[PDB]
Amino acid sequence: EEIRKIIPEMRRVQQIHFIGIGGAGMSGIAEILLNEGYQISGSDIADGVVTQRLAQAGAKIYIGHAEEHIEGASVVVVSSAIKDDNPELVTSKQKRIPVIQRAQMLAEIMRFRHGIAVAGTHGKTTTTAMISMIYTQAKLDPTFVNGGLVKSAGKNAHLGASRYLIAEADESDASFLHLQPMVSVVTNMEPDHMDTYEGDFEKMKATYVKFLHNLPFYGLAVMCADDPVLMELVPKVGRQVITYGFSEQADYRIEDYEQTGFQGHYTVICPNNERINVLLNVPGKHNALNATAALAVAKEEGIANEAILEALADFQGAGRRFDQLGEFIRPNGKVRLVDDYGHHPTEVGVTIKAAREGWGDKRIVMIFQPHRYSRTRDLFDDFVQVLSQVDALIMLDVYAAGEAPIVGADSKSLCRSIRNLGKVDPILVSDTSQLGDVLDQIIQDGDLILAQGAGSVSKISRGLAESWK
Amino acid sequence: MKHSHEEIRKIIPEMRRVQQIHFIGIGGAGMSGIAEILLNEGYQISGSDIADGVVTQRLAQAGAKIYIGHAEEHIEGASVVVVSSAIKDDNPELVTSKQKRIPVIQRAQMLAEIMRFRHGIAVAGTHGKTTTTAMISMIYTQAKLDPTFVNGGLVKSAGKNAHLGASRYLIAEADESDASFLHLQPMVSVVTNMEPDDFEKMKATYVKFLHNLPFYGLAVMCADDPVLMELVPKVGRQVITYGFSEQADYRIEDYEQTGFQGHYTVICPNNERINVLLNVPGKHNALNATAALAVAKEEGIANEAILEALADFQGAGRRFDQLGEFIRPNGKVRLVDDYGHHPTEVGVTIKAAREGWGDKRIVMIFQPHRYSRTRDLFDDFVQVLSQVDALIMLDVYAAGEAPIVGADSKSLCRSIRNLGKVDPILVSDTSQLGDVLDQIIQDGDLILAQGAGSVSKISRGLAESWKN
Ligand SMILES: Nc1ncnc2c1ncn2[C@@H]1O[C@H](COP(=O)(O)OP(=O)(O)CP(=O)(O)O)[C@@H](O)[C@H]1O
Ligand SMILES: Nc1ncnc2c1ncn2[C@@H]1O[C@H](COP(=O)(O)OP(=O)(O)CP(=O)(O)O)[C@@H](O)[C@H]1O
Ligand SMILES: [Mg+2]
Ligand SMILES: [Mg+2]
């Protein structure tokens, strides 16, 4: 093989089986290994768009779990969600077949590659997408594995013939400590409650320091200068650190930012005082940060300005990140529908701000679906404050993602709390078939409607668009 | 750019912005080899040593900038500094390196970086590492795979302890000392044996080492070592075993030594029978050679390349190393240098010598290495040294350490004398070694110069003198 001329095959691995292949992060890795020539099989509790598109591709997909699904596997990859009583997990274990976590299989894909890893609380998929598009435009034909669809490629993952790997690195459960990258980005590290001691936050800080310590002596850490937690960690990294951001002390410093429409314009001053005027095809200061992490990696690796500026000027985004669905003429006015993945209050907040800066004096209307009861409970007051910043609000019920309900942490509670704040009067919509009709009555001409959240909400907005189309 | 550098760069990437690599203590063994691979890969190399020498002149001629005495100015432009573990904080080069914030890494970590993007085969265990590493490197070379290798001893056929090859393969000795082997990330790991000298901690370190293998990696372990076999369920990776044991994956049967060559059959896991001629003596070498055969077979190498390399195998330097035959006034003798320094190592060497020497005598010149080791394994030394026909004792080779009452050569000689099997001669002034030997020699004696210290240098000077 042409890829084998670069990447060696794993000893005796003929078939890789994925238990929970529709789970987060699973499909992307499966795609790379399928394209490298391995036989791939996988199972999932539900049918869906991920699971069905891997089948087109050549993998055998099974709905439901049964021990016979593991027939012939050389190794089994399990998602975070899998429980000890999984008939396939149990059987694998008996046949004495190696069982690995998803981050471990990613590390093996990174092993003989030049890995560029992207981690942090917020912006990982976006930054990963931007780096991947720069490397692509520079003609470096990178492999990438992202936690969202890269729109220009039509996939969340792609196998390239070079040695480059661009990959999103998930800190959850220290997953990422098996990764051995050449360059590591950390976009930010945001505590749930900044003025209160939280043991899980300090532990998480310690895990990011260990992650950076996986860089070789000659490796590079790229960190946001505008995040005080990251800047405090600097002296403990012990590898070269390059910073980026609006801070006067940033190595790659952003100046003169403005947003026009949904595009950003700004200048980056490099460490040697080179000036780069950037046009970025997605909105908000938070995207200029993400794109500057990407420009900093590219410049540090010697990539030319032309390919960097072309990729950012034409950047189409990751799927669901401020993803414009179209304009729709309704009886009560012409409206613009946009999907956004933001699920944490900070992410929802940055999204609203970027919407506002491109939308003059027309209204912002949001359809919000909280993701998980646990996070809704943990940051409840912050969700109340941020959701009160829109002009009109429809709440959908919590997307459980597998969790058991928690009293006082559901949409009905969020709704009541927002109403009491009195900045906006929300409408709860528990029957989504009724969603279009409900919007129809509250809508006004020129409204920009944000379909917001990380769960099924984008499938819901999808239907709505089609029916209005 | 030279063709060789271009071809290597298509497989192995250059390390980011690393232009010059400086070695503090570059004449040390363990240092010069890694330094010469990096030189041959295209990096600028500089280094320092308190003493000038062959090595240092060797390096210096190849293109390395070498200096004697440690000195802050020696660090000029270094991108990274490599240090042995022996170094001290007062070291001028070390203190300024840290002050100029130039990364400072240990030898094993530089070895790990050479392994990072290669297909590493790592050789660990208490005894037989340098030998097994040399045998695997000779097989891979004979198979036209052009390996890179880093060994703790001279590979005689290649004339070097280390060599850069143009392929992806790396064969490397892995040292358990202070967990240094934990930095390595190999594809295949050999463990020859594990013998004490605390122990449960050493066991756990080896298990941790083997966990560094990828999920698909291979552990190759000696089936004849009960401690290794006890650890098998803790490994968590595929294990292939080798040895005389009935249950070995690669089983040795029908072994007989003829002269200084071994003859035996290896039976492979699918029952394939392979008849081996091994150009070095002793069952212990048949074990090391079968670790080597198993690795090669598991990697798909043809029988002919394995057999050819083993039939012409020349040994590692100082491992049952034949220095030739000499006619002395009272007899024609054969002189052999051996590095064995632990009682078990001395014991297998004596055995291999007996198996090749018929009814003639074995005379040994033994130099104990370290006072601490002598103290710790004293009784075992006394038993094993008692198995020769004539024994000359040199004084302990200190290697750093202060004398310990009761653990010196005089004490050893006394206890051996008291056992009544051999009556040893202590030779404190080595300028008289030749004359003492000439007075005890008989026609046909094999003389084994035995130990890990200066004994090898001493034996070769005796040889040169006897040559002229
Ligand atoms: N640097 C940044 N700082 C804060 N919020 C950001 C951000 N970049 C993006 N966001 C917001 O977060 C949402 C998700 O962006 P993105 O997918 O790139 O981040 P991420 O991958 O870290 C999400 P997750 O942690 O769920 O994987 C965006 O739609 C936007 O709401
Ligand atoms: N499998 C084995 N088992 C026991 N003794 C062995 C052995 N292989 C070699 N020896 C003996 O040990 C001596 C040194 O062999 P070698 O250099 O290969 O091992 P090693 O590299 O593990 C020594 P060190 O631990 O000092 O590095 C030989 O000269 C012989 O005395
Ligand atoms: Mg993501
Ligand atoms: Mg050795």
UniProtKB/Swiss-Prot annotation, chain A:
| Enzyme Commission number, as recorded | 6.3.2.8
What's one GO MF term for it?
Answer: ATP binding
Q: In which broad location class does this protein mainly occur, judging by the first location in its UniProt entry?
A: cytoplasm
Subcellular location field: Cytoplasm
Pfam families xref list: Mur_ligase, Mur_ligase_C, Mur_ligase_M
User: Which pathway does this chain act in?
Assistant: Cell wall biogenesis; peptidoglycan biosynthesis
A GO CC annotation given for this chain? cytoplasm
Q: Which Gene Ontology terms describe the biological processes this protein takes part in? A: cell division; cell wall organization; peptidoglycan biosynthetic process; regulation of cell shape
Has UniProt tagged this entry with the keyword Coiled coil?
no
Going by the UniProt record, its keywords in alphabetical order are: ATP-binding, Cell cycle, Cell division, Cell shape, Cell wall biogenesis/degradation, Cytoplasm, Ligase, Nucleotide-binding, Peptidoglycan synthesis
What the entry lists under InterPro entries is as follows: Mur-like_cat_sf (IPR036565), Mur_ligase_C (IPR004101), Mur_ligase_C_dom_sf (IPR036615), Mur_ligase_cen (IPR013221), Mur_ligase_N (IPR000713), MurCDEF_pg_biosynth (IPR050061), UDP-N-AcMur_Ala_ligase_MurC (IPR005758)
- What's its catalytic activity? UDP-N-acetyl-alpha-D-muramate + L-alanine + ATP = UDP-N-acetyl-alpha-D-muramoyl-L-alanine + ADP + phosphate + H(+)
Highest taxon listed in the record's lineage: Bacteria
Give the residues the record marks as binding ATP: G120, T121, H122, G123, K124, T125, T126
What function does the entry list? Cell wall formation.
Similarity comment text for this entry: Belongs to the MurCDEF family.
The protein, known as: UDP-N-acetylmuramate--L-alanine ligase
